[PDB]
Design a protein around this ligand. Sequence first.
Ligand SMILES: [Mg+2]
Ligand SMILES: [Mg+2]
Ligand SMILES: [Mg+2]
Ligand SMILES: [Mg+2]
Ligand SMILES: [Mg+2]
Ligand SMILES: [Mg+2]
Ligand SMILES: [Mg+2]
Ligand SMILES: [Mg+2]
Ligand SMILES: [Mg+2]
Ligand SMILES: [Mg+2]
Ligand SMILES: [Mg+2]
Ligand SMILES: [Mg+2]
Ligand SMILES: [Mg+2]
Ligand SMILES: [Mg+2]
Ligand SMILES: [Mg+2]
Ligand SMILES: [Mg+2]
Ligand SMILES: [Mg+2]
Ligand SMILES: [Mg+2]
Ligand SMILES: [Mg+2]
Ligand SMILES: [Mg+2]
Ligand SMILES: [Mg+2]
Ligand SMILES: [Mg+2]
Ligand SMILES: [Mg+2]
Ligand SMILES: [Mg+2]
Ligand SMILES: [Mg+2]
Ligand SMILES: [Mg+2]
Ligand SMILES: [Mg+2]
Ligand SMILES: [Mg+2]
Ligand SMILES: [Mg+2]
Ligand SMILES: [Mg+2]
Ligand SMILES: [Mg+2]
Ligand SMILES: [Mg+2]
Ligand SMILES: [Mg+2]
Ligand SMILES: [Mg+2]
Ligand SMILES: [Mg+2]
Ligand SMILES: [Mg+2]
Ligand SMILES: [Mg+2]
Ligand SMILES: [Mg+2]
Ligand SMILES: [Mg+2]
Ligand SMILES: [Mg+2]
Ligand SMILES: [Mg+2]
Ligand SMILES: [Mg+2]
Ligand SMILES: [Mg+2]
Ligand SMILES: [Mg+2]
Ligand SMILES: [Mg+2]
Ligand SMILES: [Mg+2]
Ligand SMILES: [Mg+2]
Ligand SMILES: [Mg+2]
Ligand SMILES: [Mg+2]
Ligand SMILES: [Mg+2]
Ligand SMILES: [Mg+2]
Ligand SMILES: [Mg+2]
Ligand SMILES: [Mg+2]
Ligand SMILES: [Mg+2]
Ligand SMILES: [Mg+2]
Ligand SMILES: [Mg+2]
Ligand SMILES: [Mg+2]
Ligand SMILES: [Mg+2]
Ligand SMILES: [Mg+2]
Ligand SMILES: [Mg+2]
Ligand SMILES: [Mg+2]
Ligand SMILES: [Mg+2]
Ligand SMILES: [Mg+2]
Ligand SMILES: [Mg+2]
Ligand SMILES: [Mg+2]
Ligand SMILES: [Mg+2]
Ligand SMILES: [Mg+2]
Ligand SMILES: [Mg+2]
Ligand SMILES: [Mg+2]
Ligand SMILES: [Mg+2]
Ligand SMILES: [Mg+2]
Ligand SMILES: [Mg+2]
Ligand SMILES: [Mg+2]
Ligand SMILES: [Mg+2]
Ligand SMILES: [Mg+2]
Ligand SMILES: [Mg+2]
Ligand SMILES: [Mg+2]
Ligand SMILES: [Mg+2]
Ligand SMILES: [Mg+2]
Ligand SMILES: [Mg+2]
Ligand SMILES: [Mg+2]
Ligand SMILES: [Mg+2]
Ligand SMILES: [Mg+2]
Ligand SMILES: [Mg+2]
Ligand SMILES: [Mg+2]
Ligand SMILES: [Mg+2]
Ligand SMILES: [Mg+2]
Ligand SMILES: [Mg+2]
Ligand SMILES: [Mg+2]
Ligand SMILES: [Mg+2]
Ligand SMILES: [Mg+2]
Ligand SMILES: [Mg+2]
Ligand SMILES: [Mg+2]
Ligand SMILES: [Mg+2]
Ligand SMILES: [Mg+2]
Ligand SMILES: [Mg+2]
Ligand SMILES: [Mg+2]
Ligand SMILES: [Mg+2]
Ligand SMILES: [Mg+2]
Ligand SMILES: [Zn+2]
Lengths: 50, 112, 63, 252, 91, 77
Amino acid sequence: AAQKSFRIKQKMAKAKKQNRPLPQWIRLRTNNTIRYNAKRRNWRRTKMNI
Amino acid sequence: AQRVTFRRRNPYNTRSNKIKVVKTPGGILRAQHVKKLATRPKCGDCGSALQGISTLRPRQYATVSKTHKTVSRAYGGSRCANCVKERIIRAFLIEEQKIVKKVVKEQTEAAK
Amino acid sequence: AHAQSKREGRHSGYGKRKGTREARLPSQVVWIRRLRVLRRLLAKYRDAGKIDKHLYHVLYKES
Amino acid sequence: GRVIRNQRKGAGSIFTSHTRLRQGAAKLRTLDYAERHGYIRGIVKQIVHDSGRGAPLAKVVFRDPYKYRLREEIFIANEGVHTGQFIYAGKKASLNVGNVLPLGSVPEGTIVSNVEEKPGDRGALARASGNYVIIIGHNPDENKTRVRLPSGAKKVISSDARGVIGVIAGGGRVDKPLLKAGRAFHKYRLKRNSWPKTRGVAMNPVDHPHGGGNHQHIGKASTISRGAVSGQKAGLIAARRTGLLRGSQKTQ
Amino acid sequence: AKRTKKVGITGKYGVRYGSSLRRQVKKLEIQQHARYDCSFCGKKTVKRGAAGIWTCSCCKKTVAGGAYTVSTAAAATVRSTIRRLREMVEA
Amino acid sequence: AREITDIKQFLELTRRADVKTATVKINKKLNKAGKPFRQTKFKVRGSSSLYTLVINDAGKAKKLIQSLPPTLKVNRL
RNA sequence: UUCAAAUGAGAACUUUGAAGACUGAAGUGGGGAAAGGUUCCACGUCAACAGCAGUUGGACGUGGGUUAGUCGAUCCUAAGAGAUGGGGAAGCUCCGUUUCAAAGGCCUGAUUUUAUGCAGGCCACCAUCGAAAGGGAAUCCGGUUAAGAUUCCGGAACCUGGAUAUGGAUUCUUCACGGUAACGUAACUGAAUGUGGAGACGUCGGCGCGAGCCCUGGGAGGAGUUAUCUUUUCUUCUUAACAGCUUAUCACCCCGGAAUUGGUUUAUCCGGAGAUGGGGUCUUAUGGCUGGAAGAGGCCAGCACCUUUGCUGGCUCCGGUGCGCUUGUGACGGCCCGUGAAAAUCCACAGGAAGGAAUAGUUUUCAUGCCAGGUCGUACUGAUAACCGCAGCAGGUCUCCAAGGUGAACAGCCUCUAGUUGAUAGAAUAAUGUAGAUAAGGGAAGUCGGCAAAAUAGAUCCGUAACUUCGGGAUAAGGAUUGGCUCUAAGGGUCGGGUACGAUCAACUUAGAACUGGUACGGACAAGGGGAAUCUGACUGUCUAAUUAAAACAUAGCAUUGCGAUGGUCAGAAAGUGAUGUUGACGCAAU
RNA sequence: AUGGUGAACUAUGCCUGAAUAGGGUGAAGCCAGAGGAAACUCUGGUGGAGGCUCGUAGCGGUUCUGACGUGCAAAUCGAUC
Ligand SMILES: [Mg+2]
Ligand SMILES: [Mg+2]
Ligand SMILES: [Mg+2]
Ligand SMILES: [Mg+2]
Ligand SMILES: [Mg+2]
Ligand SMILES: [Mg+2]
Ligand SMILES: [Mg+2]
Ligand SMILES: [Mg+2]
Ligand SMILES: [Mg+2]
Ligand SMILES: [Mg+2]
Ligand SMILES: [Mg+2]
Ligand SMILES: [Mg+2]
Ligand SMILES: [Mg+2]
Ligand SMILES: [Mg+2]
Ligand SMILES: [Mg+2]
Ligand SMILES: [Mg+2]
Ligand SMILES: [Mg+2]
Ligand SMILES: [Mg+2]
Ligand SMILES: [Mg+2]
Ligand SMILES: [Mg+2]
Ligand SMILES: [Mg+2]
Ligand SMILES: [Mg+2]
Ligand SMILES: [Mg+2]
Ligand SMILES: [Mg+2]
Ligand SMILES: [Mg+2]
Ligand SMILES: [Mg+2]
Ligand SMILES: [Mg+2]
Ligand SMILES: [Mg+2]
Ligand SMILES: [Mg+2]
Ligand SMILES: [Mg+2]
Ligand SMILES: [Mg+2]
Ligand SMILES: [Mg+2]
Ligand SMILES: [Mg+2]
Ligand SMILES: [Mg+2]
Ligand SMILES: [Mg+2]
Ligand SMILES: [Mg+2]
Ligand SMILES: [Mg+2]
Ligand SMILES: [Mg+2]
Ligand SMILES: [Mg+2]
Ligand SMILES: [Mg+2]
Ligand SMILES: [Mg+2]
Ligand SMILES: [Mg+2]
Ligand SMILES: [Mg+2]
Ligand SMILES: [Mg+2]
Ligand SMILES: [Mg+2]
Ligand SMILES: [Mg+2]
Ligand SMILES: [Mg+2]
Ligand SMILES: [Mg+2]
Ligand SMILES: [Mg+2]
Ligand SMILES: [Mg+2]
Ligand SMILES: [Mg+2]
Ligand SMILES: [Mg+2]
Ligand SMILES: [Mg+2]
Ligand SMILES: [Mg+2]
Ligand SMILES: [Mg+2]
Ligand SMILES: [Mg+2]
Ligand SMILES: [Mg+2]
Ligand SMILES: [Mg+2]
Ligand SMILES: [Mg+2]
Ligand SMILES: [Mg+2]
Ligand SMILES: [Mg+2]
Ligand SMILES: [Mg+2]
Ligand SMILES: [Mg+2]
Ligand SMILES: [Mg+2]
Ligand SMILES: [Mg+2]
Ligand SMILES: [Mg+2]
Ligand SMILES: [Mg+2]
Ligand SMILES: [Mg+2]
Ligand SMILES: [Mg+2]
Ligand SMILES: [Mg+2]
Ligand SMILES: [Mg+2]
Ligand SMILES: [Mg+2]
Ligand SMILES: [Mg+2]
Ligand SMILES: [Mg+2]
Ligand SMILES: [Mg+2]
Ligand SMILES: [Mg+2]
Ligand SMILES: [Mg+2]
Ligand SMILES: [Mg+2]
Ligand SMILES: [Mg+2]
Ligand SMILES: [Mg+2]
Ligand SMILES: [Mg+2]
Ligand SMILES: [Mg+2]
Ligand SMILES: [Mg+2]
Ligand SMILES: [Mg+2]
Ligand SMILES: [Mg+2]
Ligand SMILES: [Mg+2]
Ligand SMILES: [Mg+2]
Ligand SMILES: [Mg+2]
Ligand SMILES: [Mg+2]
Ligand SMILES: [Mg+2]
Ligand SMILES: [Mg+2]
Ligand SMILES: [Mg+2]
Ligand SMILES: [Mg+2]
Ligand SMILES: [Mg+2]
Ligand SMILES: [Mg+2]
Ligand SMILES: [Mg+2]
Ligand SMILES: [Mg+2]
Ligand SMILES: [Mg+2]
Ligand SMILES: [Mg+2]
Ligand SMILES: [Zn+2]
């Protein structure tokens, strides 16, 4: 890093949008079943493997 | 006491990464990157730095009035003049001897 | 205050001396000075005629 | 067992020549019209060091007679040849050190180097720091010429085959003790990866015909047949005699 | 004042390699570093530069020569043999 | 980036087609050793270089400032 | 580590002030490469997480933030990789990379149906990928942000492409003059084709000079100490790219003609192939003064007021020193069976096809002028918490910058600047520990074994054996000396001398002599135990990462073998296939 | 047994880069001088040689058969080297 390829900037940027908690309004829909976000990620817990 | 950092992302000490510490109007020390040095062009005959000709890294010779890249003589910016001297002398003399070689063996054929 | 006292030949005895004589002042450095100075004297006396060339040239090679 | 060392060198991986610094390949001029009906002049613009070579190369430039332009060849410098010198290449060319002549035209006794095997293979015989060949006779009908090589082996090649007058430079190179490991180190540095050499006797059986045992010993005869198969041939291959050479050498 | 009874330039090698070997080198080293007479301009300015190559300080001529010395004994006989043989061809 | 001294060449600069604006500068300085004196630099700005003409004489400056084209944009100090 | 304040339900742990310390410029400072990917910054904020805690965080929630013609990429080529005409292979695919190939595109001319067919002449180079440390067009300084900056703001530049118009230069001797010459210059035409240079190159050594740093005098400022003493201690006093003029060791030219040989480096080279001498010519590394540019920056004092925050004055000057340190660089010298890349790219010259003036032509390598410069990366960590080791792991992980003292020193030890003060805490100090020490008399009696420990140590002088490959053995061994202070002597630079000496300036070295002390003084730090033999390996060098470092491997040296290419040796399933081979017996291969 | 994936560790070659305080020794070459009938021999300097030596960084890994041995660590830590 520190001087990256646009391919990698993307995945990096895509991964930044996926790093939010559940939108709580979803919690309210009929039959809704998703308690929490089970696909979250931390920079110092799981590495992206590029 | 005042120390200093490279100004480019390259962190290693190479020929294209030479530094030069400098005092700015700000009163601070600062690195300045220094282009590699120019070397003098040379005689393609004797081999010396050929005098009268200016010296700058090659592409910089295209940003320069034509006089900086020449001297005003036969074979000007290209051979060292004592070289030109030589190849004039040898030219004359060998062209002359050519005459002495011809008419002499023009006699051989007639006296044989 | 100290450095001054140094200037007066102080604190320079065998006791306060940890590097060798050579390291403190390289033999060669001493030489090169001396010879540069003999050399430079000759050129003076000769550049004035105080001494002639034939004598100079002997001194040079002797120096 | 493991593939033994000498087998591995053929697949040429970490073995291949160290090529990079080398003036180019040394060669005679192509065998054109000029050089086989007359002769042609050029100047040695430079004699220089080839890397991994014993003998100095010789940059020698000529005119191209079929286009206005210079064409430079690369010669191995015979002894005593010098920059600025004129060099002659051709059947009808005078016989002084440095010139290249067909072996048909040199009186016997002539000493020559970098000689062609077939004519026009641009040099191929005695090119090494010191060596040369001696023309020991001619046979006009079926124009052959007989020469002695540096090996002492006598050979007969065609007379049109060229070779150059004189001996190769760098004489006596092998006379100086290498002296230490580093010198050979730097010797082979610019040749190929063949040094240092472990002894097959110091390895285990997996590694070599000689390997293993509770003492270091070849354990069977080290003179190995010609017909011997890959992975067997290590030691004195095809050895017809063996032991310290008593008495004079020199091919009778 | 004489510094070494015998080892000469070979005195760099200290105690190593064995006397005999130092001798063989020394002989050849004295040959290679030595300064030589120029056939062309006549000053003793020919000095070596990598095995085989001999070049004049001034006048800048370069001769190809022996590995450690300028003229191989061999080569020089060869110079003469060719002399001889050449001569026959004109006369 | 360029210095000028010809007080005729100067004038013509200030009438060049591309020379839009210019500025006049005033430093107190000192003379030889004894005393001070008022210096004045006449900077003209071309499309690719700032020519500046130092006039060390107070008198010459007062007359020069009037020679300036009235269509020129002068920045005083 | 400590005291206090503030904050908060709550404070050993957060913020702030104070105190004590630490890292000590080979950093716990300032930045980067790889790797991470938002951790960067702000606000909110503690359920989990940070092996005590928590009001704090690299955690949680929510947002904000990475600006380029000039920095990189992009282009170039390196080892190598790899399509294609081919040839192998049942086939996936293997070979080959210019090789058994009909391999392709530039300049302007021919058009004035017209847009671009043919007319010359070339040129045979025949993919492409491969470097964010190699090659390479061009930018700096000041200011600015919560967080960006050689990227924004401000000022000043430069490069490349494209357009071109005025000025100048040039020509009736058409394609300039000048200089004896080296060569000068604001210019001063030049197709094909050829040729030359630059790109472009090892390492060590001393010596010369540059820059930054270090040291230091005077003056102008601000600060510190002042029982006492000190014209004191500390600190500010700066000048970018770019441009003009000027500046060089080297090299070369002109004059002249050398034994009584001279010139000359620290280092012994130079000259009748023209020295010493005199006079000139060039390279512009580097430096000087001016432009930039004092308006900036830096230091102060003197007025204003919730504010944005101003407003007004000043000063920013002159020098010294050198085996200093770091780096840059030149002229040289040593070394080699080692002689220490390539291409893109830029210029020059040889050539002279051609085009071009007097009623007006040629000229854009002189000046000035106009338009344009895309795409992607730009945050931050770089480590005793941002990377890899299951982790905020005593491990690992490529590099630049570098102050004062002591000392030989980039050592150790103390300090300035900057940064830390993180590592659960409290009370006691039993046994046994781990780590650090001392011990009367004896001195290895301990033990497999002096294991461990002790002893030694710097520097100056004196003194030094067998043996030896004559180079060593050697710091052999053995000795003496060493502080403080006070003096003496030796060692240098710069100037004017008709064609003997005078005058001043600035240095630590080295030897000596007094006095002095609870006989101490390399006073901490730092720093070799020696000796006589046997065995074994010659030596330096190498290995079992994680129980073996050795006498084992290597080595030079010695010797033996194979081979002249239709070949030795070795690779492959094959082959119009491959290593040795850019090779040739002073060689390659095999012991 | 068949078919696949690895040289981010490590082994070795190539290509292109980068890195190493201060000391001791004093090899060729060079200058001046001394003796000697001669042949030749000596002294003082200068100079800076080496897979040389003292020793940091670096690289390594000898001993304590030291620490640790449910570790900081699936190889580390200390001193010594
Ligand atoms: Mg940066
Ligand atoms: Mg280097
Ligand atoms: Mg680069
Ligand atoms: Mg010129
Ligand atoms: Mg010039
Ligand atoms: Mg000396
Ligand atoms: Mg002097
Ligand atoms: Mg002399
Ligand atoms: Mg190859
Ligand atoms: Mg090897
Ligand atoms: Mg071996
Ligand atoms: Mg062997
Ligand atoms: Mg074994
Ligand atoms: Mg077997
Ligand atoms: Mg067998
Ligand atoms: Mg065996
Ligand atoms: Mg045996
Ligand atoms: Mg605490
Ligand atoms: Mg606090
Ligand atoms: Mg401290
Ligand atoms: Mg240190
Ligand atoms: Mg820390
Ligand atoms: Mg990270
Ligand atoms: Mg975020
Ligand atoms: Mg933060
Ligand atoms: Mg809680
Ligand atoms: Mg955590
Ligand atoms: Mg906790
Ligand atoms: Mg808790
Ligand atoms: Mg967040
Ligand atoms: Mg650039
Ligand atoms: Mg691009
Ligand atoms: Mg292929
Ligand atoms: Mg490419
Ligand atoms: Mg690059
Ligand atoms: Mg800034
Ligand atoms: Mg912003
Ligand atoms: Mg920043
Ligand atoms: Mg701007
Ligand atoms: Mg502007
Ligand atoms: Mg342009
Ligand atoms: Mg003119
Ligand atoms: Mg070319
Ligand atoms: Mg070239
Ligand atoms: Mg290079
Ligand atoms: Mg200061
Ligand atoms: Mg610049
Ligand atoms: Mg002169
Ligand atoms: Mg003159
Ligand atoms: Mg000196
Ligand atoms: Mg450095
Ligand atoms: Mg060389
Ligand atoms: Mg050029
Ligand atoms: Mg122009
Ligand atoms: Mg385009
Ligand atoms: Mg940044
Ligand atoms: Mg950073
Ligand atoms: Mg951190
Ligand atoms: Mg991690
Ligand atoms: Mg993981
Ligand atoms: Mg860790
Ligand atoms: Mg930090
Ligand atoms: Mg702990
Ligand atoms: Mg406790
Ligand atoms: Mg006791
Ligand atoms: Mg006793
Ligand atoms: Mg006893
Ligand atoms: Mg006992
Ligand atoms: Mg025992
Ligand atoms: Mg016993
Ligand atoms: Mg012990
Ligand atoms: Mg004791
Ligand atoms: Mg012995
Ligand atoms: Mg002994
Ligand atoms: Mg005393
Ligand atoms: Mg005195
Ligand atoms: Mg005096
Ligand atoms: Mg050994
Ligand atoms: Mg092991
Ligand atoms: Mg194992
Ligand atoms: Mg060992
Ligand atoms: Mg071990
Ligand atoms: Mg033997
Ligand atoms: Mg076939
Ligand atoms: Mg690797
Ligand atoms: Mg060193
Ligand atoms: Mg020492
Ligand atoms: Mg050393
Ligand atoms: Mg006498
Ligand atoms: Mg040395
Ligand atoms: Mg060594
Ligand atoms: Mg050692
Ligand atoms: Mg030491
Ligand atoms: Mg270590
Ligand atoms: Mg090692
Ligand atoms: Mg250990
Ligand atoms: Mg243990
Ligand atoms: Mg335990
Ligand atoms: Mg050590
Ligand atoms: Zn010569």
